Design a protein around this ligand. Structure first.
Ligand SMILES: [K+]
Ligand SMILES: [K+]
Ligand SMILES: [Mg+2]
Ligand SMILES: [Mg+2]
Ligand SMILES: [Mg+2]
Ligand SMILES: [Mg+2]
Ligand SMILES: [Mg+2]
Ligand SMILES: [Mg+2]
Ligand SMILES: [Mg+2]
Ligand SMILES: [Mg+2]
Ligand SMILES: [Mg+2]
Ligand SMILES: [Mg+2]
Ligand SMILES: [Mg+2]
Ligand SMILES: [Mg+2]
Ligand SMILES: [Mg+2]
Ligand SMILES: [Mg+2]
Ligand SMILES: [Mg+2]
Ligand SMILES: [Mg+2]
Ligand SMILES: [Mg+2]
Ligand SMILES: [Mg+2]
Ligand SMILES: [Mg+2]
Ligand SMILES: [Mg+2]
Ligand SMILES: [Mg+2]
Ligand SMILES: [Mg+2]
Ligand SMILES: [Mg+2]
Ligand SMILES: [Mg+2]
Ligand SMILES: [Mg+2]
Ligand SMILES: [Mg+2]
Ligand SMILES: [Mg+2]
Ligand SMILES: [Mg+2]
Ligand SMILES: [Mg+2]
Ligand SMILES: [Mg+2]
Ligand SMILES: [Mg+2]
Ligand SMILES: [Mg+2]
Ligand SMILES: [Mg+2]
Ligand SMILES: [Mg+2]
Ligand SMILES: [Mg+2]
Ligand SMILES: [Mg+2]
Ligand SMILES: [Mg+2]
Ligand SMILES: [Mg+2]
Ligand SMILES: [Mg+2]
Ligand SMILES: [Mg+2]
Ligand SMILES: [Mg+2]
Ligand SMILES: [Mg+2]
Ligand SMILES: [Mg+2]
Ligand SMILES: [Mg+2]
Ligand SMILES: [Mg+2]
Ligand SMILES: [Mg+2]
Ligand SMILES: [Mg+2]
Ligand SMILES: [Mg+2]
Ligand SMILES: [Mg+2]
Ligand SMILES: [Mg+2]
Ligand SMILES: [Mg+2]
Ligand SMILES: [Mg+2]
Ligand SMILES: [Mg+2]
Ligand SMILES: [Mg+2]
Ligand SMILES: [Mg+2]
Ligand SMILES: [Mg+2]
Ligand SMILES: [Mg+2]
Ligand SMILES: [Mg+2]
Ligand SMILES: [Mg+2]
Ligand SMILES: [Mg+2]
Ligand SMILES: [Mg+2]
Ligand SMILES: [Mg+2]
Ligand SMILES: [Mg+2]
Ligand SMILES: [Mg+2]
Ligand SMILES: [Mg+2]
Ligand SMILES: [Mg+2]
Ligand SMILES: [Mg+2]
Ligand SMILES: [Mg+2]
Ligand SMILES: [Mg+2]
Ligand SMILES: [Mg+2]
Ligand SMILES: [Mg+2]
Ligand SMILES: [Mg+2]
Ligand SMILES: [Mg+2]
Ligand SMILES: [Mg+2]
Ligand SMILES: [Mg+2]
Ligand SMILES: [Mg+2]
Ligand SMILES: [Mg+2]
Ligand SMILES: [Mg+2]
Ligand SMILES: [Mg+2]
Ligand SMILES: [Mg+2]
Ligand SMILES: [Mg+2]
Ligand SMILES: [Mg+2]
Ligand SMILES: [Mg+2]
Ligand SMILES: [Mg+2]
Ligand SMILES: [Mg+2]
Ligand SMILES: [Mg+2]
Ligand SMILES: [Mg+2]
Ligand SMILES: [Mg+2]
Ligand SMILES: [Mg+2]
Ligand SMILES: [Mg+2]
Ligand SMILES: [Mg+2]
Ligand SMILES: [Mg+2]
Ligand SMILES: [Mg+2]
Ligand SMILES: [Mg+2]
Ligand SMILES: [Mg+2]
Ligand SMILES: [Mg+2]
Ligand SMILES: [Mg+2]
Ligand SMILES: [Mg+2]
Ligand SMILES: [Mg+2]
Ligand SMILES: [Mg+2]
Ligand SMILES: [Mg+2]
Ligand SMILES: [Mg+2]
Ligand SMILES: [Mg+2]
Ligand SMILES: [Mg+2]
Ligand SMILES: [Mg+2]
Ligand SMILES: [Mg+2]
Ligand SMILES: [Mg+2]
Ligand SMILES: [Mg+2]
Ligand SMILES: [Mg+2]
Ligand SMILES: [Mg+2]
Ligand SMILES: [Mg+2]
Ligand SMILES: [Mg+2]
Ligand SMILES: [Mg+2]
Ligand SMILES: [Mg+2]
Ligand SMILES: [Mg+2]
Ligand SMILES: [Mg+2]
Ligand SMILES: [Mg+2]
Ligand SMILES: [Mg+2]
Ligand SMILES: [Mg+2]
Ligand SMILES: [Mg+2]
Ligand SMILES: [Mg+2]
Ligand SMILES: [Mg+2]
Ligand SMILES: [Mg+2]
Ligand SMILES: [Mg+2]
Ligand SMILES: [Mg+2]
Ligand SMILES: [Mg+2]
Ligand SMILES: [Mg+2]
Ligand SMILES: [Mg+2]
Ligand SMILES: [Mg+2]
Ligand SMILES: [Mg+2]
Ligand SMILES: [Mg+2]
Ligand SMILES: [Mg+2]
Ligand SMILES: [Mg+2]
Ligand SMILES: [Mg+2]
Ligand SMILES: [Mg+2]
Ligand SMILES: [Mg+2]
Ligand SMILES: [Mg+2]
Ligand SMILES: [Mg+2]
Ligand SMILES: [Mg+2]
Ligand SMILES: [Mg+2]
Ligand SMILES: [Mg+2]
Ligand SMILES: [Mg+2]
Ligand SMILES: [Mg+2]
Lengths: 121, 249
RNA sequence: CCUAAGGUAGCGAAAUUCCUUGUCGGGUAAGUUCCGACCUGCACGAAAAGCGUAACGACCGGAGCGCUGUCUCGGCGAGGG
RNA sequence: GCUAGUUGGUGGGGUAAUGGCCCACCAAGGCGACGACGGGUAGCCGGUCUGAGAGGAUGGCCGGCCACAGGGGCACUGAG
RNA sequence: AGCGCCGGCCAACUCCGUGCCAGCAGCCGCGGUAAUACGGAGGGCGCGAGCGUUACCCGGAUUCACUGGGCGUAAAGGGC
RNA sequence: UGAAACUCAAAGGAAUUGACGGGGGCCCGCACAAGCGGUGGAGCAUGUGGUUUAAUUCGAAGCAACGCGAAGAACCUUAC
RNA sequence: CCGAGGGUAGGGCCCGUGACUGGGGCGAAGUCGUAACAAGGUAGCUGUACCGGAAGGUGCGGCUGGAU
RNA sequence: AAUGCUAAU
């Protein structure tokens, strides 16, 4: 565009979109589990991925992934959720934090224990 | 329970034509197995495919203990092999679903008049002194449910009463059938689920000539024998597990 | 299989629906009427016109507000008998 | 598209003081695509973070100014 | 004395277990009976009273281009 | 005039080497046509599918598996 | 007189929700056909109009991002 | 004149 056109109209800035709107600007959110189940991933992966339906303190109700091998979550469990989507699961945008509230740490975990919330043996 | 007759429904899962061919293989295997155990088999429903498979096949196992011995075959069966519909020689993973139900009863439906209330009253509309003075209109009420049927079609109280009772019987029979069908549908869904590759109950690996039952971790290497109807080892292992699971306390 | 040909658009429990107070939603503390839908149209349907339509109606439905001897439940008074 | 104390004038009231700030009367003006009016959001700055610079984001603590003191309105005392 | 990491980006590799399962994942992607990508072990790399993760901002983004972009066929010349 | 939610990890332009066409051109082969003799019908031999069986060992699967591995299964062979 | 607030009536805008209804995105498998990519077996595309289970067909005109 | 070929190099 010409200089006069830039003076008349300018350049439009770029507005970013939040990928974790249910967090409402917080790093983490507490919630209560309503449904715990397994879901199947999209092509090409094949598995039974453990997820929870979580009703949060911020008013939203979302789906969160449960990482690690084995878990103790069930209906009415209190959990903490953090950002981060699971690529191969449709509509899953959040991760349950292991080792907080009613979500126990991963048993017999020996590597990368700060994730999965396992104490030093 | 374990002593009645069995209804077996085999449906093709994921995999298309190969899935239908695998459903046909399962059908042959179960037919030969039932013959080897002494039962009598009749095919109730059949939907074949052009290549010789079945998209769906429903048959009956008649004999004391048919359901009890076929009750471990319910679920998703997974096959890993090179299809005959495959052109490039790749291995494919397909599934077939098996549903096992106990054959039910055909108890006839009748109206118990002790729970039925009949009211008679004047009809509405034309007729002069006749309709002004006659108790021709009939109402029948099924007291347990509160369902009522009213008949006014004829000038005669007797015919109206008979018609109302007939209509009430048909309505109650329809409701009974609907609830039975809903219960059976829920049972079927609980058995077969979605037919996805996961949630499988048994895997038949042809390249490795291996059969694996994942409920009990039982692997054997006689795939041809199993597919010819030799299911006794797997079934005895499953019965072992069922008897051991009740170790209380 | 049969017909000269097998009902199109639109509308539909209708001034048309027998079962019927169909079913679901609304309105009411409670709604066989009413309104909005569904389609199983006994037996809608295109100039004996079909579907809409602002304005108009001592036409026929349904609801609310205002106000009341209509009523709860009657009482007194006036005049003509 | 907005505006009827609205825009201006005259006289007055009030104030420490100018002023439609307020009132009475007279005129019909004032504002707007250089974005009025309306809606949403927000205390502002010195600065801070980032960036080769230009720019972008931001205004916690510290210094400056403003606003508020349960939610609204009002005046008294007083240099304030 | 701990924490993260060891397929590429990116520094640091072998054995066993499992067998599209369990699981990993920022992107590309790994896993379906010989997996440097899952879990454990031995070893290694980077930091170290810290090491990672989530959220948000700038950078990389010359990807709103003033510095510093474009419009025949990739998005883009208004029918005249 | 003109969005968003949601979703994907690409969607695209030009050119290159192939492959393919019920595109074109020029050619070729018992490919057709021109001929002669067969097979498909019968009986029998033999190999195979299926079915049966205690077992009817195993492999070979369009052309390029089926008088094929087998240029010699009463026992042996022989693997059931 | 003004006046916080309260009351009554009628509007404007926005948000949540609703029997039912319309399409959209997605799917390691289903049913129906085969419209496009080769002259894709009726050259394709296109504005408009009417029609048909569906992709689509046909009429009128236009373009080559087609041939001759 | 002649329709179609799922899904793991
Ligand atoms: K109707
Ligand atoms: K009628
Ligand atoms: Mg210029
Ligand atoms: Mg994978
Ligand atoms: Mg670690
Ligand atoms: Mg009557
Ligand atoms: Mg009469
Ligand atoms: Mg009567
Ligand atoms: Mg009589
Ligand atoms: Mg119609
Ligand atoms: Mg109608
Ligand atoms: Mg109508
Ligand atoms: Mg109705
Ligand atoms: Mg009704
Ligand atoms: Mg009507
Ligand atoms: Mg009726
Ligand atoms: Mg009636
Ligand atoms: Mg009713
Ligand atoms: Mg009714
Ligand atoms: Mg009703
Ligand atoms: Mg209802
Ligand atoms: Mg209601
Ligand atoms: Mg009402
Ligand atoms: Mg109500
Ligand atoms: Mg209400
Ligand atoms: Mg009510
Ligand atoms: Mg009610
Ligand atoms: Mg009702
Ligand atoms: Mg009524
Ligand atoms: Mg009424
Ligand atoms: Mg009503
Ligand atoms: Mg009505
Ligand atoms: Mg109505
Ligand atoms: Mg109605
Ligand atoms: Mg209904
Ligand atoms: Mg409808
Ligand atoms: Mg009806
Ligand atoms: Mg009509
Ligand atoms: Mg006519
Ligand atoms: Mg007529
Ligand atoms: Mg007529
Ligand atoms: Mg008329
Ligand atoms: Mg009409
Ligand atoms: Mg009318
Ligand atoms: Mg009108
Ligand atoms: Mg008018
Ligand atoms: Mg009117
Ligand atoms: Mg009107
Ligand atoms: Mg008028
Ligand atoms: Mg009117
Ligand atoms: Mg008028
Ligand atoms: Mg009039
Ligand atoms: Mg009127
Ligand atoms: Mg009139
Ligand atoms: Mg009248
Ligand atoms: Mg009247
Ligand atoms: Mg009238
Ligand atoms: Mg009237
Ligand atoms: Mg009415
Ligand atoms: Mg009326
Ligand atoms: Mg009324
Ligand atoms: Mg009222
Ligand atoms: Mg009233
Ligand atoms: Mg009275
Ligand atoms: Mg009274
Ligand atoms: Mg009175
Ligand atoms: Mg009363
Ligand atoms: Mg009364
Ligand atoms: Mg009374
Ligand atoms: Mg009363
Ligand atoms: Mg009284
Ligand atoms: Mg009285
Ligand atoms: Mg009295
Ligand atoms: Mg009285
Ligand atoms: Mg009195
Ligand atoms: Mg009295
Ligand atoms: Mg009196
Ligand atoms: Mg008196
Ligand atoms: Mg009087
Ligand atoms: Mg008197
Ligand atoms: Mg008197
Ligand atoms: Mg004034
Ligand atoms: Mg003013
Ligand atoms: Mg002024
Ligand atoms: Mg500064
Ligand atoms: Mg600097
Ligand atoms: Mg600078
Ligand atoms: Mg500040
Ligand atoms: Mg301020
Ligand atoms: Mg305040
Ligand atoms: Mg407070
Ligand atoms: Mg003082
Ligand atoms: Mg003072
Ligand atoms: Mg390296
Ligand atoms: Mg991995
Ligand atoms: Mg890891
Ligand atoms: Mg391994
Ligand atoms: Mg890694
Ligand atoms: Mg490892
Ligand atoms: Mg830098
Ligand atoms: Mg870059
Ligand atoms: Mg920039
Ligand atoms: Mg740059
Ligand atoms: Mg520039
Ligand atoms: Mg560019
Ligand atoms: Mg261009
Ligand atoms: Mg160009
Ligand atoms: Mg293009
Ligand atoms: Mg572009
Ligand atoms: Mg373009
Ligand atoms: Mg031009
Ligand atoms: Mg153009
Ligand atoms: Mg032109
Ligand atoms: Mg997007
Ligand atoms: Mg010849
Ligand atoms: Mg012959
Ligand atoms: Mg023959
Ligand atoms: Mg012969
Ligand atoms: Mg053989
Ligand atoms: Mg072999
Ligand atoms: Mg040969
Ligand atoms: Mg030969
Ligand atoms: Mg021989
Ligand atoms: Mg021997
Ligand atoms: Mg021998
Ligand atoms: Mg809404
Ligand atoms: Mg075409
Ligand atoms: Mg084609
Ligand atoms: Mg085509
Ligand atoms: Mg074709
Ligand atoms: Mg064609
Ligand atoms: Mg064509
Ligand atoms: Mg065509
Ligand atoms: Mg073409
Ligand atoms: Mg073309
Ligand atoms: Mg056209
Ligand atoms: Mg026309
Ligand atoms: Mg046509
Ligand atoms: Mg084809
Ligand atoms: Mg094809
Ligand atoms: Mg087809
Ligand atoms: Mg073809
Ligand atoms: Mg193929
Ligand atoms: Mg194809
Ligand atoms: Mg293909």
């Amino acid at each position: 565009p010409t200089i006069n056109q830039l003076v008349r109209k300018g350049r439009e800035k770029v507005r970013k979109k939040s990928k974790v709107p249910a967090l409402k600007g917080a790093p983490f959110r507490r919630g209560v589990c309503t449904v715990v189940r397994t879901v199947t991933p999209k092509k090409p992966n094949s598995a039974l991925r453990k997820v929870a339906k979580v009703r949060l303190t911020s008013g939203y109700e979302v789906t969160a992934y449960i990482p690690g091998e084995g878990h103790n979550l069930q209906e009415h469990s209190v959990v903490l959720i953090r950002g981060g989507r699971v690529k191969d699961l449709p509509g899953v945008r959040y991760h349950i934090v292991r080792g907080v509230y009613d979500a126990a740490g991963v048993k017999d975990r020996k590597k990368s224990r700060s994730k999965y919330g396992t104490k030093k043996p | 329970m374990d002593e009645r007759d069995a209804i077996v429904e085999i449906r093709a899962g994921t995999g298309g034509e190969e899935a239908a061919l695998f459903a046909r293989d399962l059908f042959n295997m179960y037919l030969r197995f039932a013959e080897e155990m002494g039962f009598e088999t009749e095919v109730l429903d059949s939907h074949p495919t052009d290549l010789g498979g079945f998209s769906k096949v429903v048959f009956e196992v008649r004999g004391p203990g048919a359901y009890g011995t076929f009750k471990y075959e319910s679920g998703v069966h997974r096959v890993q092999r090179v299809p005959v519909t495959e052109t490039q020689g790749r291995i494919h993973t397909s599934t077939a679903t098996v549903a096992v139900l106990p054959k039910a009863e055909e108890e006839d439906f009748a109206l118990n008049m002790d729970e039925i209330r009949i009211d008679v009253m004047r009809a509405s509309g034309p007729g002069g002194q006749g309709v002004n003075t006659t108790d021709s209109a009939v109402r029948v009420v099924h007291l347990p449910t509160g369902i009522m049927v009213t008949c006014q079609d004829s000038r005669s109280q007797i015919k109206n009463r008979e018609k109302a009772l007939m209509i009430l019987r048909s309505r109650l029979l329809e409701m009974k059938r609907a609830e039975e069908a809903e219960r059976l549908r829920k049972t079927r869904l609980a058995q077969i689920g979605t037919g996805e590759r996961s949630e499988k109950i048994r895997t038949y690996n042809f390249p490795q000539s291996r059969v694996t039952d994942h409920r009990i971790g039982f692997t054997t290497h006689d795939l041809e024998g199993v597919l010819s109807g030799h299911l006794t080892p797997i079934l005895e292992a499953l019965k072992r597990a069922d008897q051991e699971r009740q170790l209380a306390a």
